[PDB]
Every structure is written in C-alpha cells, then in structure tokens.
C-alpha cells in the first residue's frame, strides 16, 4: 500500500533531509541515555542492535543483552535483531511496521524511516 514516504522518495527528495534530522533527534533523545549516538540513519540501524535497545528505552528498561546479538556475526543474526525489535513493537501495542526486517539490514532507508516514524507517532511525548 502506497503512503507519504513513497511521495517523499519519488517526488520530493528535497524534504528528505528534514525528515532525517528530526528522526535523528528523536532517536538520539533516547539513545543518548545509554551514551549512544546516531548520525546516519541508514547504516547505524542495520545491526538491529540500536533498534532493539531503543525499544527498551521507549518502554523505560534495559533489554537483556542475551536476548539478542550485540555483535551480529552474519546477515541472519542481523535479521533476527530487527525482527526481535519488531516483536517488541507489537508488545508495546503499536501497529506492525509495513517493512520487511531484511530491508532494514539491507540498508533500505525508506523502510528504516517508516519504522522509525511509527515509533515517533506513539512515543512523541516520552521524555
């Protein structure tokens, strides 16, 4: 199903930097609590590591480090991390992201932004 991010990547790429920067601040607002920082949304979320930890942060807890792969050895360990974060998104009562977990690992920015914006809409007010 087509949405606003499809409009952004096809017809308005000039607005992309504005999307990137605001989602960077939202993501850093929580990840800075763990002494972590995100400068590039594409490459820094492909691990799943930050995505998993962010999910805990948005629900106000440290995720046990053995629940996922802190240093993923392969593509399939990275895919597991992402889908594990997706399951945490379901636990938080959020609607399932319309993105394949493989795309996040494969550095699909459109998919990553969609996932991150889903978190934004729900966790807007969370300090």
């Amino acid at each position: 199903e087509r949405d606003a991010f499809d409009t952004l990547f096809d017809h308005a790429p000039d607005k992309l930097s504005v999307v990137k920067k605001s989602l960077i601040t939202f993501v850093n607002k929580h990840l800075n609590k763990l002494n972590l920082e995100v400068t590039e949304l594409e490459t820094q979320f492909a691990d799943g590591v930050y995505l998993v930890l962010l999910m805990g942060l948005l629900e106000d807890y440290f995720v046990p480090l053995h629940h996922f792969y802190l240093t993923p050895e392969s593509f399939d360990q990275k895919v597991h991390n992402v889908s594990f974060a997706f399951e945490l998104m379901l636990d938080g009562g959020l609607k399932k992201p319309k993105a394949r977990p493989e795309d996040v690992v494969n550095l699909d920015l459109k998919s990553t932004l969609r996932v991150l914006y889903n978190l934004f809409t729900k966790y807007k007010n969370v300090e």
Binding site: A4, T7, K15, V18, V19, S22, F120
Partner: peptide, 12 residues
C-alpha cells in the same frame, strides 16, 4: 497534502 502533514508532524 499527506506528505505535508508528515513533515509538520516531525517539525513539532
């Protein structure tokens, strides 16, 4: 218009 609201949402 749908993209305009998205950008405004992120800018608030």
């Amino acid at each position: 218009d749908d993209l305009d609201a998205l950008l405004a949402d992120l800018e608030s």
